[PDB]
Design a protein around this ligand. Sequence first.
Ligand SMILES: [Ca+2]
Ligand SMILES: [Ca+2]
Ligand SMILES: [Cl-]
Ligand SMILES: [Cl-]
Lengths: 287, 287
Amino acid sequence: DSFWEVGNYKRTVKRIDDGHRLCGDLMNCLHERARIEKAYAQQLTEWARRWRQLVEKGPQYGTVEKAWIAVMSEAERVSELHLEVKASLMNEDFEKIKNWQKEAFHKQMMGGFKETKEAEDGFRKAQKPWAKKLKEVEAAKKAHHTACKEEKLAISREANSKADPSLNPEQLKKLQDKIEKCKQDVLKTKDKYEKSLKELDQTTPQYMENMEQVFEQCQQFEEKRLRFFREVLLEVQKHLDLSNVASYKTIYRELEQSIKAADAVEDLRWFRANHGPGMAMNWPQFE
Amino acid sequence: DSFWEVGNYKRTVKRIDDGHRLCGDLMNCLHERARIEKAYAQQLTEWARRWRQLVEKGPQYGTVEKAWIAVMSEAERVSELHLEVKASLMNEDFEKIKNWQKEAFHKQMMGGFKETKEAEDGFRKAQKPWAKKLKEVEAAKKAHHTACKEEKLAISREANSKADPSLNPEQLKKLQDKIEKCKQDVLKTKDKYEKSLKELDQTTPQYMENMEQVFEQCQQFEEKRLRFFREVLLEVQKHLDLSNVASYKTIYRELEQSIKAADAVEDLRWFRANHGPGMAMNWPQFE
Ligand SMILES: [Ca+2]
Ligand SMILES: [Ca+2]
Ligand SMILES: [Cl-]
Ligand SMILES: [Cl-]
């Protein structure tokens, strides 16, 4: 069926509540992910703390130890970034939505929202006249299609004397009497039936305005929401994007640094002077 | 105290068994790293399957819907990357260390490594001659400082003769013989104490030389593990680095462009003509 048909704006008004619903959704969606971003960061700092300790108590000293611990550090510094994502999603994006939802929706006392009950009210009194003066027409339709069908009944019960030569005098008098009263009956109904249509076609213009006038407002409101989503999702896109960052490559430019700084020659060197033949020795002498 | 003191070559030998353990530690270190990269991916893909349904089943249609879902996609393509890390870590870095750690370590039929019992036996082979040559000197020490101190007591037997005209020169002869007997036990022992040292010096150049080769043979083997750790870690750093990854930057340049394609006007135009004043209508007529 059509929107212009009485009470079919229902699905345009329903979009309002759906709008409020789509806010909470976009919030939970962001939040639920923000929680995952922290889950990763937390697992990294925990892991780092674990091995930064295991390596410490480990038997592996020297420059290699530093090169090793450099990875525990990268894990931490990565956690710092991902731990920043979380906040960037909640403190900014999430809230920026929560606020928009309140400054756009107002919970009516009874139920639903103000801007929802208003659209309904608006559409109603913007369709009322075209609906009421649609009853005059419809009440005239079943008033004419009842008389116009009543005419054929007279035309039928008029030739009922083609077999029975009964009271012919009183017959052709009454038969041609009812078909005449029915002639004006169908004509007077059509006359008042054409009127109702005029009375409606005159209500149409004003009805075409008030409706679209109430509808246009909804579109504008929905626009503010759509354009708002494109605005938030973009920010979110930048809060997830770590490729377009400089501090990221840094973490992996310095990791390569520390690892390369592992001079094996220098390690064996140290070990040679502290545990190897490089140690002093009181060679046995006369006492 | 010093490495050159007999037996004090354990620290440099214990280094061997440590080298093995260390490998096992670094393997667990990487395994736990990837195991987290996996859990992080699993959480992402499931976050996608989670909301990719809620959005498609939700009241959010049109371009804005696509822009929204566009996020789920980035959440998947990212998860896919961290899964490449898990594999790279376990299939290469890990399987590499494990492989190396077995090709350089062979457990005995008794326990311990063939290379552990390799250096120890080697050290003893080069130190035994020096040790046994020293055990003689050590005995000569409790040989000269046993007759030389035995000499000092011989003077006591004479010093005690200051106010005791006891025996005759007959006894003086008994203490007079110790002049050409006790003194000999000091000049003959000190003479041999010389030999023990002189002869030991003939067994120290060959001693250090030999003791050196063994130690260097450890420096060689140890070097291999060190340089290996460097080679490995370098690769590991590269398997964790998503900075210089072509696919990574693309993910977001693609997400962003997808969100910018979210035309608000596009969605609006559609609704008005599908549920609004745009819909056609059978304006009442004569029947
Ligand atoms: Ca250590
Ligand atoms: Ca949908
Ligand atoms: Cl409220
Ligand atoms: Cl209220």
